[PDB]
Design a protein around this ligand. Sequence first.
Ligand SMILES: Cc1cc2nc3c(=O)[nH]c(=O)nc-3n(C[C@H](O)[C@H](O)[C@H](O)COP(=O)(O)OP(=O)(O)OC[C@H]3O[C@@H](n4cnc5c(N)ncnc54)[C@H](O)[C@@H]3O)c2cc1C
Ligand SMILES: Cc1cc2nc3c(=O)[nH]c(=O)nc-3n(C[C@H](O)[C@H](O)[C@H](O)COP(=O)(O)OP(=O)(O)OC[C@H]3O[C@@H](n4cnc5c(N)ncnc54)[C@H](O)[C@@H]3O)c2cc1C
Lengths: 240, 239
Amino acid sequence: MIPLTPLFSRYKDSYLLYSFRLIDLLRASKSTHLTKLLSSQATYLYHFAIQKYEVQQLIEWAINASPDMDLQQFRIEFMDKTTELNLRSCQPKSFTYTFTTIWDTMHFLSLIIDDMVYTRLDFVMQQLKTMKVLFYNVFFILQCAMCRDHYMNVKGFIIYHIELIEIALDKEKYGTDITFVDSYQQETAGADVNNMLMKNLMAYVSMTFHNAINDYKWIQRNKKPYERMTWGEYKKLLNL
Amino acid sequence: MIPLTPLFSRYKDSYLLYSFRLIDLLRASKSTHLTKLLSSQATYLYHFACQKYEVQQLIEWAINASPDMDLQQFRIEFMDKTTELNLRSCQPKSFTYTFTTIWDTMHFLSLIIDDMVYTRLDFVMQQLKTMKVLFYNVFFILQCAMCRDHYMNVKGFIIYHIELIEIALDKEKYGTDITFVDSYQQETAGADVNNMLMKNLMAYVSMTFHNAINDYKWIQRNKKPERMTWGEYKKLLNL
Ligand SMILES: Cc1cc2nc3c(=O)[nH]c(=O)nc-3n(C[C@H](O)[C@H](O)[C@H](O)COP(=O)(O)OP(=O)(O)OC[C@H]3O[C@@H](n4cnc5c(N)ncnc54)[C@H](O)[C@@H]3O)c2cc1C
Ligand SMILES: Cc1cc2nc3c(=O)[nH]c(=O)nc-3n(C[C@H](O)[C@H](O)[C@H](O)COP(=O)(O)OP(=O)(O)OC[C@H]3O[C@@H](n4cnc5c(N)ncnc54)[C@H](O)[C@@H]3O)c2cc1C
């Protein structure tokens, strides 16, 4: 399982706030396609957080919630509903929603993938496909049109690496064990010639992706760019 | 300044064939948005095809060509139109369309990018965004539903590396020169601290992508799986 650190504590709570803010959109939805997409995303999110039958109750409650409530009244009704369904664990501790709420959710999902793979095969390959669906369908909820447009262009970078893992798991299914390496360069050296996978690959993929977004935004605003996060420091922050 | 080689000449003729097939879709288009997108993409492809006003006349000819022609009849009218506009260069020598026509176009575009960068400016930084738009908007044209769905999932891998190039040219605009290195590993090791950029990045990037797609399709077909190596690829193209 994932190591308990302060930073991982915020991730889990950002993940719950994010999940809460996503289901609040269900009552507002203006299309059947959005409703099906929000319903499945939130179901999938909680399934990575019987718990599953209670979650179906929560999700169904949110689909039929009044569309004329504001957000704070939805929060009141949600707090009660999760308490009643014995899902206090779904309840966020902090309701301040920002970019760090989205980043934490993506970094959380990355750590979850690394844990499922190191601690693992049909099951892990079905989870990895649900993860691709989650990353493909990240919503910002907050207002940032240009963030949405940027993310739709490059989200495949993350998603591509999930497929490398599936490719690696497919080789283990067929005879070649996965070999775990400590640096991205070794994994990338291997593919150009045997089944090497970086340990904590997705933590590093999403970290590298975080930096690239933040590097690119200076082009966006047209200003000269300053502490960037390093894999060394990140691993220390998360006890990896 | 792309090295003229056998594989590259096929890339070039595949590029032209892909472009001819795209503008053939303009007469059929069922939405004003798809019309907007195909004519932009075709204009862009031609603009990179290793005069612009003549291309605009070609495109405008395609927009108004009869929707009740079949494709072969369109090919007849296109071969005449390009002959009249003094654009015999846009004419493909082979009209057999396959997955290799699409791959060849993608690998062609990758080689254009690496050539603009090492022979470079706000100019190259602007041409890269157009490159991003082209890769975001690749049409298969042939029938491969699961292909389009796979490519829409992972196309960002390619596009991300175009952004790393803009990021690198932005640091050069503001002081730090690009340092060209020989492996992908040296570029990804130095991002983690300085402005290194792999030489022939997009050739390597779209080469690795091509392998990934082909490895992934054994998962897609549920089947127990000769892959292209960088050294072999650089040999084939004289990089
Ligand atoms: C998918 C996504 C796309 C975005 N696209 C854009 C855009 O196009 N234009 C724009 O202006 N903004 C964009 N943003 C927001 C942007 O990335 C920043 O969050 C914001 O612009 C300024 O945030 P910041 O530097 O103050 O903190 P942030 O960059 O948000 O980081 C906050 C926290 O995350 C942790 N952290 C910081 N860096 C890393 C890292 N490399 N790896 C792991 N953890 C880290 C740290 O704990 C830090 O406390 C996007 C955000 C997301 C989640
Ligand atoms: C964007 C895109 C997405 C696709 N998604 C799918 C999918 O999801 N499922 C599916 O079944 N098919 C998919 N395809 C088609 C698939 O990749 C193959 O083209 C097809 O299966 C034919 O396989 P092949 O090995 O015979 O030839 P190809 O893989 O098409 O190779 C043909 C030519 O390309 C050259 N070549 C081969 N490998 C490389 C390489 N790594 N780098 C550079 N050049 C190379 C060689 O010169 C060879 O002659 C996709 C194609 C594209 C262009």
